[PDB]
């Protein structure tokens, strides 16, 4: 009765497919964002320097 079961499972009564999904490879990256440099400016304005 054991052989008859093994005899019941065929190649054309139990095919055996393989299937995987396409997985992207993991990757570890660094990104440092530093804003534009900020420069001190000193200006004086007097009535003469405008007129000059």
């Amino acid at each position: 009765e054991e052989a008859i079961k093994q005899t019941l499972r065929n190649k054309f009564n139990y095919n055996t497919r393989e299937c995987q999904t396409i997985n992207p490879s993991i990757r570890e990256r660094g990104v440092s964002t530093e804003p534009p440099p900020s420069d001190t400016i000193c200006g004086n304005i007097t009535q003469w320097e405008i007129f000059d």
Binding site: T46, Q47, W48, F51, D52
Partner: protein, 96 residues
């Protein structure tokens, strides 16, 4: 010439005058004829800033009208400055 270099010699020799000092437009000493150097170095740095600050005073009120001659008067001393674009002449005269 005898005429600038003589007149400058004449005002120095003149009685009750401590010394005449020429300042360059860039706050530099061309000629400095005082007794002690500390006073001459101090006058070379300090006074031409007062004259530039005092030029901006007369200029604000009327920007056509430029400084021709500045005279301060202290308790013991007088300080007289004749500014020009190329050079500035400074003197210290004790009050009579």
């Amino acid at each position: 010439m005898s005429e600038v270099e003589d007149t400058l010699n004449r005002i120095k020799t003149h009685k009750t005058v401590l010394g005449y000092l020429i300042v360059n437009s860039e706050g530099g000493v061309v000629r400095g004829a005082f007794k002690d150097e500390e006073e001459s170095k101090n006058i070379a740095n300090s006074i031409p800033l007062l004259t530039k600050k005092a030029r901006s005073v007369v200029r604000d009120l009327d920007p056509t009208n430029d400084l021709v001659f500045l005279r301060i008067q202290t308790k013991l001393n007088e300080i007289m400055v004749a500014p020009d674009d190329e050079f500035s002449l400074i003197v210290i005269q004790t009050k009579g």
